[model samples]
Target: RKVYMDYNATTPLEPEVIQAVTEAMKEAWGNPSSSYVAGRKAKDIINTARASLAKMIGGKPQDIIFTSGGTESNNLVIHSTVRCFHEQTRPHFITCTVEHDSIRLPLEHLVEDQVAEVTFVPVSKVNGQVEVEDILAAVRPTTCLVTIMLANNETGVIMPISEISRRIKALNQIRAASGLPRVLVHTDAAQALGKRRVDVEDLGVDFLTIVGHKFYGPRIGALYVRGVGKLTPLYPMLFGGGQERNFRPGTENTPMIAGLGKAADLVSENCETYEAHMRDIRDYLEERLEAEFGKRIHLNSRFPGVERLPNTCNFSIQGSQLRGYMVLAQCQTLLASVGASCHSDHEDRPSPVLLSCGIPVDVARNAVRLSVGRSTTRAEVDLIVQDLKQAVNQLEGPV
Candidate 1:
């Protein structure tokens, strides 16, 4: 039997979501832009998806714009902000050092192009979280945006997005009085949606990125653009026939959108139950590992005074020669990650996120991320723990 514990990377589609996608593929195949009955049906599917996504984040239906996935949604926000502030003198941006590559690379590219100057705020070494004061200190008169993830993909440590947003809002009031641009706040909630309560109003963010695959949906995404009774203006990133209200262009992907809607409905209804199950299973796995390995295992997901994703358990084993990949390789029936799946190609190197959190290079190199999901069972957790213990024993010699 195989135990898959890498929910943060992606998830298997729910049966309801698959049904929705199949139904849309067969019945809603027309272009949403056309005025015919088939087109109207297709458009309704898109709108329904949009509505569920928006409601998931407590936003209006019109504010949600579909995209290819989290990567595109992230890029669109960064590019759109750069374009919107082009006339200004090198508009400034703020983000933490622990952001996923999707946000980090684009911002780095902008810096290389001299399009914008960014302040990459360092996170707390203790908790892997950025301080609200640190972010506030980086704010400037020219700062146009502050993009941060709601949770770290590797450590699963949740950021103080709401506190940061409140601080920015207070600062915006001062900036508005001084005739400066308000600092728009954006959060990549790709790893946060299914694990916690995600509400746009509660977070008070101008933009929030949602990836469907992170929550057992199709591989599609949506961006929540907050509005004050009406939509906010965002510069178009792509040009073509007016789609997504001229924000994101391309033919609407009806089947995927329908699947995403069904997934959103499920999340809205079962997030609490899923959260409890994952938390219980994750805690049980940790207990088993601790009982089996004793002082040899070290947890890397300990965030003091900060909340972590209930489903994620990141840890490392203590051994000079042992690495995460080696143990994972030995566990034939266990499937987990050494770090974020995106960084899997660089297995020889230590995880940059863990390193940034002041974890030693050896520990960082040995870090394994096991993220449980709704389907994860206690029996599977016990099996995974046994497998990991056996793998570690095999790698490190007899205990």
Candidate 2:
């Protein structure tokens, strides 16, 4: 059996999610916009799924707009909002250095096109935490959007979005009183949805991104637009038929949406218990790994005092003789992730995320990301650690 420990990359489908997708594919086979009996059946599946996902995130059903996945949803918000802002003043957007490529790359294009000005705040290397005050300081008169990720992909560190949102809200009040448009807050909650308690209202974000595969669902994702009649500000990037309130113009992906809905429903019902259990197992794994590896390994994930994803452990093996890929390649039964994106051309390249956080290039090359999931067992954890022990020993040789 392949001991899959890359939940951060994507989760295995839940049994309920699989059943939901199967049933939708087999039975709901009409265009949701057709208005006939079959069409109504298809529409009902979409609506029900929307409601389930809405409830999971403490959002209203109407606020949820389905998209292909995290990348599309994120791109939609950035492109649409920037276009809307461009009509008036040059848009200034704020984000951190540790954001996923979905946000990072798009922002680069926006900047290159001279469409928007961006402020990339730095995160602390010691804790992987973003300073809310630094983000607030970046706000300018033309600052239209603040896009931040709720949890980081490489470090699993939970950002202070709620606190940042609260500050933005307070600032928006001042801006509104001055007859200026308030800054719109958007968060990519792709990594934080199931692991953290996400309430859009509590977070005070105008938009929140949700990806299903990160939570044991399909590749489909959703965007939560807050307030009644507030979604209009987001101009549609994809234009055509009236699907997704014209925000997304493609035909409804019913099966994947249903699967995503089921996944959200399960999280709503079991998250509290499930998260607690995951944290316990994670603690156990860390303790045992440290016992075996001792000073040879460095834990990258933040500890109990700061909020972080319970299931993720990003670490670096301290040795000049080997890289993380070298160890992972030798573990026949264990499947995991290295923090660096694979590139055969750039074999010695280090992880940009770690480097942004001030980690040394040598340590970044040795970084590995092992994320657990709902079905992860203690025995599996032990077996993987044992494999790691052998791999490390082999690399060290007579040392």
Candidate 3:
């Protein structure tokens, strides 16, 4: 059995998602920007999709703007908000060390060009999580934006976005009283949506990014900006057409958008059941691995109290050093990863995200990130355990 556990990188497109995408491609291929009957048909499809996605996250449909994927969704918020005002007028942005490359890479470019100032808070090695208080401490008089991810992709460690949001609101109130610019909170909730209950109202974030690929949909994504009227504090990242309310301007990808809507509906219906199911299999996978390897294994993922994603488990072997990739390479039956799919090929390099969480360089190199999906099964997991045991023995001696 070829067991696939690298769900964090991308999920398999569900059957319903495929059906929706195909339907859109075959029936609604007209340009949405046109005013004709065919155009109105396409427009209706997109609007319905937007509403479905908004319903999944408890957000107003008017706030949701479709983008290519998570990377664009994240960049849209960072670029748009910072560009809304002049360099001197814009305040410093705040983020954490454990953010995905989508967030870190763009922020780094912004800082390098001196277009924006940024502060990256560090996470604790003990729990692999960042503190909300630390984020608040980094806030300055000129701080204008706080963009933190709802969860870390590697360790599955959930961040305290709700607490951060609450505190930012309180601080913004203080700023309002003092007649200073209020700080806006943005979160890359791309890794969070289907895995947990991600209600924008409950999170209290000014902006949130959602990715369909993370939820067994398509490559389409959406950015939720909290508003009933004018969407100030944000500008257009792309400017060609007036699509996405002139914010993310481009011709809409109708098929992917429809697929994402179907995906969101499915996720909303099964979020709780899927969570419980994946959590059970994930815990069992960990237990089976622990029983097989004993002291030879070291689990790098956060424990129960720390609040990690139910589907993710990251671990390193005690004596394997940086041989996580080697083990996976030899285990042909199981498809997993040493880190992000983008970084899996760099065997000698350590995960910077893990290092940011204060993990040792050697441990980070040996860390394997196994993220299960809704379709993951106990039988597949059992076979993966056997394959992993043999692979580990070949690389790190008999267990």
Candidate 4:
């Protein structure tokens, strides 16, 4: 069997999650917006899923809104709110280069509409980390929303969202003293969901977004509006019977929502246990690889002290320009690759994330991302390391 080291692409469904979804399909099959008892039961199941999702990420139940997936959730919020802000005044936007295309595309559209002007803060190294000072410096008078990813999909590096939040808050105070507009913060925490503990409150973000498949469930997603209870039904991205508070309309996805809820429940219960287990394996995986190759393997993830998701190691062979797909081809037992999945379409384009982060284009092209998860084991790790050594040698003529 292929060793699926590419959790960043998508996670496989857990058995319990599948069972929960099946049970929900059998029990609640009515439209959440309808008036009958069956409808009310359907509404309850969906709402329960929303509440459970919030609980997973330290958000309030009232703040949650279900959507098709991360892309729709991001695009809807950005478009809707940008339109809202544009009616009032011109808005300035901010994001880093490494954001998921979902986050980047909305801002690109805003730029096209001439409703908002944006600044893309640069990241440090190929690991896709941004500095708080750079973000604060980019802030402008009409700055409305700042969107950034929590953990990079390609690099396991977790953004300093806490530090970014603190900087933005501090700058908000400074700019308010100068009578500037207060900017709302938005974080695409999609990649960070189950790989690490996500606490929206602790992170101090105004908006926190999540995708269900990242954690081990269905393809649907949810976002937290922070104080959505106060807002009247927001305009739906797609028009229909006002489901999900009209934030996202049409019929509720009962089965997928149930699966997401089950995934959330499982993560909430075993987070600590899983974290400890992943750490031990991650350490062993790295120690074994690095001990043999040392710096000959250009370890592309964040530095040791930096906060990174536990199960990822974005490493590459030294002195190599090995494309991610070539590496994937060579290491079939280790299903790892390079750069963002969106960029996977264009194998020739240089990783903008790496270039933005000051990684040499040559090295960035050579980088391979290895992300492990639930099914990863010590023996598996050992065997994969052996395969990696062989693959590196095969690709670059010598390790």
TM-score of each: 0.98, 0.96, 0.96, 0.93
Q: lDDT for every model?
A: 0.90, 0.85, 0.86, 0.78
Q: Which residues of candidate 3, in runs, are more than 4 Å off? A: 87-90, 228-232
Q: Rank order by lDDT, top first?
A: 1, 3, 2, 4
Candidate achieving the largest lDDT? 1
Ranking by TM-score: 1, 3, 2, 4
* Model 4 per-residue lDDT tens digits across residues 200-231: 87787877777988889899988788777463
The numbered model that scores best in TM-score is 1
Model 3: residue 75 alpha-carbon error in angstroms:
0.7
**Clash-forming residue pairs, model 1:** none
Question: Model 3 lDDT vs. the true structure?
Answer: 0.86
* Winner by TM-score between candidate 4 and candidate 2: 2
For residues 41-152, write the lDDT of model 2, one tens digit per residue: 9899999999999999998998889999988999988987787786655788999998988898899888999888899988876677888999999999999889999988
Q: For model 3, how many clashes?
A: 0
lDDT digits (tens) for residues 75-146 of candidate 3: 988887776545333458899898988999998998898887899888876777888888999998778789
| lDDT measured at residue 139 in model 3 versus the true structure, 0 to 100 | 92
